[PDB]
Design a protein around this nucleic acid. Structure first.
Ligand SMILES: Nc1ncnc2c1ncn2[C@@H]1O[C@H](COP(=O)(O)OP(=O)(O)OP(O)(O)=S)[C@@H](O)[C@H]1O
Ligand SMILES: Nc1ncnc2c1ncn2[C@@H]1O[C@H](COP(=O)(O)OP(=O)(O)OP(O)(O)=S)[C@@H](O)[C@H]1O
Ligand SMILES: Nc1ncnc2c1ncn2[C@@H]1O[C@H](COP(=O)(O)OP(=O)(O)OP(O)(O)=S)[C@@H](O)[C@H]1O
Ligand SMILES: Nc1ncnc2c1ncn2[C@@H]1O[C@H](COP(=O)(O)OP(=O)(O)OP(O)(O)=S)[C@@H](O)[C@H]1O
Ligand SMILES: Nc1ncnc2c1ncn2[C@@H]1O[C@H](COP(=O)(O)OP(=O)(O)O)[C@@H](O)[C@H]1O
Ligand SMILES: [Mg+2]
Ligand SMILES: [Mg+2]
Ligand SMILES: [Mg+2]
Ligand SMILES: [Mg+2]
Lengths: 338, 340, 330, 326, 319
DNA sequence: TTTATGTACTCGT
DNA sequence: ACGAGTACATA
């Protein structure tokens, strides 16, 4: 099959030593496979470890390579099943998560699980029974060297320094890097620093933020300043709200007054700035009730961002004195439910 | 039971030693039961509007009204949500409380009305009717209008302002005023003569009467508390005690007036969280908090006017909303800004 | 023996001696059959339901209206799916054959009328259903929309139907009906009792009927054989006496924030509704010529803020206390 | 029965395209569409009751033969526009083509701004898939309730609100057909309260015809229009405005009460009348305009909530007096 | 009657050269059609920019010999589900048709943004299983709702809004194909009323040709008037209050526009506004939302818009 | 937790 | 194929 297989297929790591990034995770996986038949750190018997982290970084590839080097039978005398996409349930199986939990507990083979970044609330069956081998954003040295090798074999050149920008734009997605390089090299083989800006602005990989992460980004004094207004426009703030609109208005209220107002108007104090923003949440209280009343006016959802998430965080903003404050109104209903 | 609130409840209109005008009004309405229209009792809490309704059903129906049971019925609403609400059952009359959730409360009342309206009249009593979110009232304004011979509606509520205009239009406005200090002092004297209380001076009776501020149930409960704590001895030096809600509101008011900072804001927000965890409506919290704030002699006329203006604004804001934390937090921020 | 709220219901078009502009049209379309879709909107208690009931009774007699008229209210489900599964089925089928007795005693049109009572508290999806429900089969059925708030009904549905406004039952329009009811029920009254009753009610003849019934019940219970006086109907209506209003006004005019606070606490423990207090304060201040123009304007705005805050829930005590304090500082 | 047993709105439905007036700019465009044989997907927009469905029905009758009843499928909100219903009905209807004697097929979507976004995503692909021999006509009143792709694929047509010419032509036609007489003040009032809708004009004129004891040999004047429509007289509005502006509080309050009690006038209608006659008078300053607009909005909001009428009447008086106190 | 084909299909391209827009994407598509090893791609953007017609042209250049059986045109008009889609994809993938060595089958999912999550989870599995045998393609509207791992496994090719030059040259191509007299003023009116969309430009052009034949701004505005975002832009930035009131009346109230549409457009314009301060923008947004609530509750009145701009000017002049 | 309408799903009869 | 229980999205 000449010029038929994709670049991610024809340049997959043949050997486990050919992988790039997460070297400690690879070592831990090799130790877990080696110590499987002996059942120090306790990971030998505390089995059924998964490979979770950024998508498209080689977790399935690393599992396949460590399986084939150890002689295990690849499946998706030693045999292994490399079951991918644990989040493929998407909140489904309606108790089949318990079936998978018992399957993790008792199996004659080293069950390896691979999933993307975990947002699903189905962590309960695998809370403390399986080893959490954490994969993170990879570095820019081994991946860089792999990119040089691929470019040398594919007869094109790229600047070593811009590879940092390509990795940051895709946020550590090696498969996406390979796909982007193939796409650009189909037309423009040469990669220089002149087209990095347009490449990044065409291949931005926007992703969501855990309800705790959005609060830190929203409660920043830089974005509401003159300099940060263009970097983070008003459209982006409301678009950021829609990522976690179920939990965004509750998270902002619990911590907006817990940070110093770096954007104080001359003549404005801390107490008065909070008061000018404390009432605005009550204006958004009217909108939230009216949106989800019997009338069901869902066209007013973008308004609720400004009245309950933006303006309360716009009057007061700055570096928070502590960690992100989780909303307490949800916790109070649990007490009131009893 | 052992509670003092059930043993001293009046048994008939002969025991209504509260208002001669109201008793005569009830007797006049009981003179012609056939021409009885829909009734609406209003007044401050503790006046006994439920007692007046119950005595009116005694005067109209006769016997069998005091004997009633409790029933539980299943209800169906949108999606697959299922709600349960208890209804008290009597052989002759029926009454249902709106204590269930206020959004889908209309359909439960509708299904009860068209289940008991399939075929002299059966009076229905809706206590604390101000909690209806303009939908159950919209059902009632048609159900009572089209069915004006089989079921008569009795409206028990206070502060008719949330109640829509047509409901009051098709209802009779009857007053239940709070009695003065004299009547409540006499009823407390009657209670302590029914029991065996070693009352030293009559001034403590006046003080415990004035502590209620036109509310019979809290006065009777605190009298029972005094009898239990002081061993049925109402001495002149009896230590006055108040419910912990008023105590913590007074503490929060003292915290606000003594300092205006951010840590105090965090503490009073935590107190607000505790109070809303104590399962209490927020309107009375705002009302009694504003009462506590205005009781400080340090406050001046401009600050008090600003306080009451912000109180009214956040009162309408809380009325047009559900998240009670936001309005209370904003009002506390405004009053701390005004004080500072 | 039935309550006067429904026993004296108007059973005839001519019996409705108010809103004659919307009555003569119906009376003249009894003979004809070109009855358009009508929209009955106005203040509550003006007899829109009574008018449509009289029209239904006079049009189809006693049986063709059972066999033809379909009624749907807020008591029944009024969702879009319910409308699609019920109103479409009712409109698609043709009219029933009238009985031989109904072709000589009643000029029954060969169509039917479907009433939609209390359409204000009804969603826009049903509105989307009805905009074409009333146009697809207009030749076989007619539709009625009755609501005290025409604003809730959108421009399309309001334009499709005939906006028959119902005149407010003021003090110079509903005197004859209540008077005739008074001599029909044989109740004694003074010269100005009827005018005071009509002035107290905000265009609500049903409310006036209830007050008259209560006054008659009291008079027959006491049995002293005395005519109804103005103070009696003030006490029935919950109207605060003028002396208490005067002392409240003079306490407000004297400042004394603490005195105002304790007297307001006493006044709300007296159990009087804040709407009546606002009405009485307005009718006392506006008629009085002592205050200058700017004070009149600002106290009128404070009363407006008070009642437009009251009607959205809130607590009457807080609103009245704020109103009295803020007019005391003017 | 047929005629003489229908409301004037439906009795005089335009069967042909020549009976639609006031939309001549779009009428000639659609006439050239049918004449030149170039009809893309339609999208009619305009005020409620402004000749959309009547125009499309007349166009369908002009294009097709007698078989339009059993071959053309029209789906409304009452007929439901669910995604499954669309997929198993409209797609099957558009895919099937009769072999002989066919140029194209027509599907009309009425009040299309009432279905879900997934439904619009289905309809746009049905539009762009079978457009070789099927055309889609979309009727809507809210362009912001529909996906931008649906607006882009269909040819947008905006119906300008019906002017006095079309209304007076319809009035002349209905008085000729029904043997009725009208007065210049009555038709001027009809123009004033028309609000750009023919349905309201027809309903009001029907009420006027039914108002007279003897419809034959009788004339309808402006007072009849005002009493049937429940609208306040312009003389009454001018008198109320002058009394509030010039006279003191007590006399103005008494005059307003007398005006309301003379013919049962409504506070709200007086409010729109007075606020639409304020802008005819030139104002010197600028913040008085802001105060007037916000105060009129507040009092209309309160009336929409309800309340005791005299309170908002005195509120209107105070609003006007405080706004013009400068 | 005998209707000619609409101008949409009378100008639907069959070659990559006829497609207008950005140059990089179209030359990449042409080069990858020449090579034949077309990678999996996801296409998203505002409607009418060449999201599915470019895919169809690329499929033609790849396999114009076996179009009827080697390109599964899975349309959004057809039935869509987690199982009914994957069954058809599996049936189209398991077949052993002898394709040319430099050619692969193309699976087209037009407007696939509205699929459920599990459908995408099955799609990624099928895509990674049969990548060597068949290739996928997407022409969705917005890629934000598309889950990230599918974007990672594919090559993201995002177009931009069409400029004036490409739409203008396409309109000249239409004019020379139809031999219709035109004017530069009519051309600029057409491209301004096109709001970036070129399909809307074609629709306005055919409407103008049928109605009058001469391309002039007056008739163009008569059928398709000025876009509402820019007129609301002018209405909201006017310094004088009564001028703003007259502008709004003449442009939206006498034009038949619904009031709630006006409020929604004003909210969107204030969201996209950049000429004023950010806090002033938030205050304008919140008062516009208050007016939106006052209209959605049922009070649809011109006076609501008047009060809205009264508050706008009150903010403008700092009270 | 929220709230009806719609959409989607799948196991079962 | 159709009815009912199920969870999720509503820019
Ligand atoms: N370190 C690496 N060096 C070179 N190529 C890599 C590397 N990691 C991944 N790849 C390529 O990217 C592809 C990604 O395959 P997978 O391992 O299945 O991705 P993943 O990390 O499991 O995430 P999912 O499950 O696909 S969302 C591999 O098949 C390789 O072609
Ligand atoms: N014009 C009238 N003449 C005589 N009685 C009237 C008139 N209008 C109302 N009533 C009386 O008002 C009472 C109830 O009338 P309704 O028809 O229910 O008024 P309404 O308009 O339906 O009020 P709603 O339903 O709250 S909007 C009956 O006792 C009628 O006799
Ligand atoms: N240009 C016009 N000339 C004459 N009569 C008209 C005109 N436009 C509308 N009408 C009348 O309006 C009546 C009802 O309007 P329809 O055409 O049925 O509905 P519509 O105008 O399309 O608006 P919708 O969609 O129903 S809210 C018709 O019976 C006509 O008599
Ligand atoms: N870039 C383009 N070049 C040439 N014609 C185009 C272009 N984009 C759209 N068209 C024309 O628009 C019509 C089909 O447009 P589409 O391709 O369906 O629009 P789209 O950009 O793909 O957005 P979607 O996916 O349909 S919502 C045909 O008449 C095409 O000729
Ligand atoms: N006229 C009366 N005589 C004696 N006790 C009374 C009288 N009116 C009220 N009460 C007391 O009030 C109590 C009931 O009050 P309740 O009806 O709960 O007030 P509310 O209806 O305002 O909640 C009873 O325990 C009863 O003892
Ligand atoms: Mg995997
Ligand atoms: Mg009624
Ligand atoms: Mg229509
Ligand atoms: Mg497309």
């Amino acid at each position: 099959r000449e010029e038929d297989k994709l670049w991610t297929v024809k340049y997959a790591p043949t050997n486990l030593q050919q992988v790039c990034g997460n070297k400690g995770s690879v070592m831990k996986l090799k130790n877990w496979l080696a110590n499987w038949e002996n059942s120090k750190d306790g990971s030998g018997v505390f089995r059924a470890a998964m490979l979770y982290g950024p998508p498209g970084i080689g977790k399935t590839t690393a599992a396949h390579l460590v399986a084939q080097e150890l002689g295990y039978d690849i499946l998706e005398k030693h045999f292994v099943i490399i079951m991918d996409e644990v989040d493929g349930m998407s909140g489904g199986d309606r108790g089949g998560v318990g079936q998978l939990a018992q399957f993790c507990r008792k199996t004659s083979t080293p069950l390896i699980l691979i999933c993307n970044e975990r947002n699903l609330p189905k962590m309960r069956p695998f809370d403390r029974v399986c080893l959490d081998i954490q994969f993170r954003r990879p570095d820019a040295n081994s991946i860089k060297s792999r990119l040089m090798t691929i470019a040398i074999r594919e007869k094109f050149k790229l600047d070593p320094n811009v590879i940092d920008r390509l990795i940051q734009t895709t946020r550590g997605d090696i498969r996406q890097v390979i796909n982007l390089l193939s796409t650009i090299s189909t037309t423009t083989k040469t990669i220089n620093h002149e087209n990095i800006n347009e490449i990044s602005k065409a291949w931005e990989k926007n992703i969501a933020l855990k309800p705790f992460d959005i609060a830190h980004k929203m409660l920043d004094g830089q974005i509401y300043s003159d300099i940060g207004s263009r970097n983070f426009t008003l459209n982006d703030k409301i678009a950021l709200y829609f990522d976690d609109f179920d939990f965004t208005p509750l998270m902002i209220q619990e911590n907006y007054l817990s940070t110093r107002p770096s954007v104080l108007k001359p003549g404005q104090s801390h107490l008065e700035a909070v008061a000018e923003a404390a009432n605005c949440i009550s204006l958004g209280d009217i909108v939230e009730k009216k949106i989800r009343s019997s009338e069901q006016l869902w066209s007013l959802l973008p308004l609720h961002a400004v009245l309950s998430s933006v303006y309360p965080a716009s009057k007061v903003a700055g570096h928070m004195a502590g960690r992100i404050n989780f909303t307490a109104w949800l916790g109070q209903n649990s007490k009131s439910a009893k | 039971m052992s509670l003092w609130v059930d043993k001293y409840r009046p048994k008939s209109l002969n025991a209504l030693s509260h208002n001669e005008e109201l008793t005569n009004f009830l007797k006049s309405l009981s003179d012609q039961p056939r021409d009885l229209p829909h009734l609406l009792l209003y007044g401050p809490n503790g006046t006994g509007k439920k007692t007046r309704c119950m005595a009116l059903l005694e005067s109209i129906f006769g016997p069998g009204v005091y004997r009633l049971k409790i029933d539980v019925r299943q209800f169906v609403t949108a999606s697959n949500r299922k709600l349960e609400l208890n209804v008290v059952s009597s052989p002759y009359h029926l009454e249902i409380t709106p204590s269930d959730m206020g959004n889908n409360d209309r359909i439960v009342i509708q299904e009860l009305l068209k289940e008991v309206a399939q075929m002299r009249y059966k009076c229905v009593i809706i206590n604390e009717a101000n909690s209806l979110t303009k939908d159950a009232q919209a059902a009632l304004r048609r159900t009572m209008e089209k069915y004006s011979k089989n079921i008569r509606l009795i409206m028990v509520c206070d502060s008719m302002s949330p109640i829509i205009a047509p409901i009051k239009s098709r209802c009779l406005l009857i007053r239940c005023p709070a009695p003065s200090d004299s009547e409540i002092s006499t009823i407390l004297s009657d209670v302590v003569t029914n029991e065996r209380i070693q009352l030293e001076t009559k001034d403590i009776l006046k003080r415990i009467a004035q502590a209620s501020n036109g509310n019979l149930r809290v006065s009777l409960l605190m009298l029972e508390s005094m009898a239990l704590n002081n061993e049925l001895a109402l001495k002149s030096s009896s230590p006055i005690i108040k419910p912990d809600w008023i105590i913590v509101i007074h503490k929060l008011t003292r915290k606000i007036v003594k300092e205006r900072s951010v840590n105090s804001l965090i503490e009073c927000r935590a107190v607000l969280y505790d109070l809303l965890a104590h399962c209490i409506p927020a309107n009375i919290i705002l009302k009694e908090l504003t009462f506590s704030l205005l009781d400080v002699e340090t406050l001046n006329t401009t600050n008090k006017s600003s306080i009451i203006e912000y109180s009214s604004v956040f009162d309408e804001r809380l009325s047009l909303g559900n998240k009670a934390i936001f309005h209370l937090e904003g009002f506390i921020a405004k009053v701390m800004c005004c004080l500072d | 023996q039935q309550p006067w709220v429904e026993k004296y219901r108007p059973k005839n078009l001519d019996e409705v001696t108010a809103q004659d502009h919307a009555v003569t049209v119906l009376k003249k379309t009894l003979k004809s059959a070109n009855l358009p879709h009508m929209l009955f909107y106005g203040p509550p208690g003006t007899g829109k339901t009574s008018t449509i009931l009289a029209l239904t009774k006079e049009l189809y007699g006693p049986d063709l209206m059972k066999s033809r008229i379909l009624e749907l209210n807020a008591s029944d489900e009024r969702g879009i799916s319910i409308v699609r599964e019920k109103v479409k089925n009712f409109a698609r089928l043709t009219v029933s054959k009238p009985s031989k007795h109904d072709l000589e005693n009643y000029p029954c049109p060969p169509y039917k009328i479907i009433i939609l009572d209390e359409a204000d508290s009804m969603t826009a999806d049903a509105q989307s259903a009805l905009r074409r429900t009333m146009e697809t089969y207009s030749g076989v059925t007619r539709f009625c929309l009755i609501c005290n708030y025409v604003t809730r009904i959108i421009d399309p549905l309001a334009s499709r139907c005939s906006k028959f406004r119902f005149k407010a039952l003021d003090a110079s329009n509903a005197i004859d009906r209540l008077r005739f009811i008074s001599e029909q029920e044989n109740v004694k009254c003074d010269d100005g009792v009827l005018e005071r009753i009509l002035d107290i009610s905000a265009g609500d003849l049903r409310r006036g009927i209830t007050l008259l019934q209560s006054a008659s019940k009291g008079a027959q219970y006491l049995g002293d054989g005395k005519n109804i006086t103005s103070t009696q109907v003030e006490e029935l209506a919950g109207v605060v006496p003028h002396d208490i209003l005067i002392e409240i006004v003079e306490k407000v005019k004297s400042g004394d924030f603490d005195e105002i606070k304790k007297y307001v606490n006493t006044f709300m423990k007296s159990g009087w509704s804040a709407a009546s207090v606002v009405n009485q304060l307005h009718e006392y201040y506006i008629t009085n010529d002592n205050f200058d123009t700017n004070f009149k304007n600002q106290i009128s705005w404070l009363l407006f803020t008070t009642d437009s805050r009251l009607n959205n829930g809130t607590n009457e005590h807080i609103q009245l206390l704020n109103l009295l304090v803020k007019i005391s500082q003017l | 029965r047929s005629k003489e047993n229908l409301p004037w709105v439906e009795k005089y439905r335009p069967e042909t395209l020549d009976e639609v007036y006031g939309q001549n700019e779009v009428i000639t465009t659609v006439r050239k569409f049918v004449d030149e044989g170039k009809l893309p997907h339609l999208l009619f927009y305009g005020p409620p009751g402004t000749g959309k469905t009547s125009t499309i029905v007349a166009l369908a009758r002009e294009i097709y033969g007698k078989n339009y009843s059993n071959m053309v499928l029209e789906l409304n909100a009452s007929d439901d526009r669910g995604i499954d219903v669309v997929r198993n009905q409209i797609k099957d209807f558009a895919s099937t083509r009769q072999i002989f004697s066919k140029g194209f097929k027509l599907i009309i979507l009425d009040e299309a701004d009432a279905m879900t976004n997934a439904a619009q995503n289905a309809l746009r692909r049905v539009i762009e898939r079978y457009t070789k021999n099927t055309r889609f006509c979309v009727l809507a009143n809210y362009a912001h309730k529909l996906t931008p792709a649906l607006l882009s694929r269909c040819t947008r047509f905006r119906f300008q609100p019906l002017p006095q010419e079309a209304i007076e032509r319809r009035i002349a036609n209905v008085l000729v057909h029904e043997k009725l007489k009208l007065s210049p003040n009555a038709e001027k009032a009809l123009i004033e309260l028309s609000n750009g809708d023919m349905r309201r004009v027809l309903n009001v004129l029907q009420s006027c015809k039914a108002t007279l004891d003897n419809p034959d040999e009788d004339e309808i004047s402006d007072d009849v229009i005002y009493e049937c429509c429940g609208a306040p007289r312009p003389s009454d509005l001018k008198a109320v405005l002058k009394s509030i502006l010039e006279d003191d509080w007590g006399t103005a309050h008494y005059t307003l009460n007398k005006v309301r009690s003379a013919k049962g006038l409504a506070l709200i209608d007086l409010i729109e009348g007075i606020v639409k006659i304020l802008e005819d008078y030139e104002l010197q300053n600028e913040e008085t305009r802001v105060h007037l607009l916000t105060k009129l909005a507040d009092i209309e909001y309160s009336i929409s909530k309800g309340g005791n009428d005299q309170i908002q009447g005195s509120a209107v008086i105070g609003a006007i007096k405080a706004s013009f106190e400068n | 009657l005998s209707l000619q084909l609409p101008w949409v299909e009378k100008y639907r391209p069959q070659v990559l050269s006829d497609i207008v827009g950005n140059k990089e994407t179209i030359d990449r598509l042409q080069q990858i059609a020449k090579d034949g090893n077309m990678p999996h791609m996801i296409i998203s953007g505002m409607p009418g920019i060449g999201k599915t017609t470019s895919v169809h042209c690329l499929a033609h250049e790849l396999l114009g010999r076996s179009y009827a059986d080697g390109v599964l045109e899975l349309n959004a008009s057809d039935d869509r589900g987690i199982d009914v889609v994957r069954n058809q994809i599996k049936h189209f993938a398991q077949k052993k048709l002898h394709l040319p060595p430099g050619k692969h089958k193309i699976v087209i999912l037009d407007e696939a943004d509205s699929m459920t999550a599990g459908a995408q989870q099955a799609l990624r599995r099928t895509m990674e299983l049969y990548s060597n045998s068949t290739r996928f393609a997407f022409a969705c509207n917005q890629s934000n709702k598309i889950i990230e791992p599918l974007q990672s496994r594919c090559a993201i090719l995002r177009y931009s809004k069409l400029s004036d030059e490409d739409v203008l040259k396409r309109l000249l191509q239409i004019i020379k194909l139809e031999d219709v007299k035109y004017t530069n003023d009519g051309l600029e009116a057409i491209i301004f009323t096109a709001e970036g969309d070129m399909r809307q430009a074609i629709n306005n052009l055919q409407s103008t040709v049928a109605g009058h034949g001469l391309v002039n701004a007056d008739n163009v505005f008569k059928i398709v008037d000025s876009p509402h975002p820019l007129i609301v832009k002018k209405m909201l930035l006017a310094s004088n209050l009564e001028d703003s009131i007259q502008i709004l009346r003449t442009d939206l109230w006498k034009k038949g526009y619904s009031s709630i549409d006006i409020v929604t457009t004003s909210f969107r314009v204030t969201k996209n506004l950049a000429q004023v301060k950010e806090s002033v923008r938030l205050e304008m947004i919140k008062e516009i939302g208050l007016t939106h609530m006052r209209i959605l509750e049922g009070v649809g009145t011109y006076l609501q818009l008047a009060s809205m701009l009264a508050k706008i000017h009150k903010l403008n002049n700092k009270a």
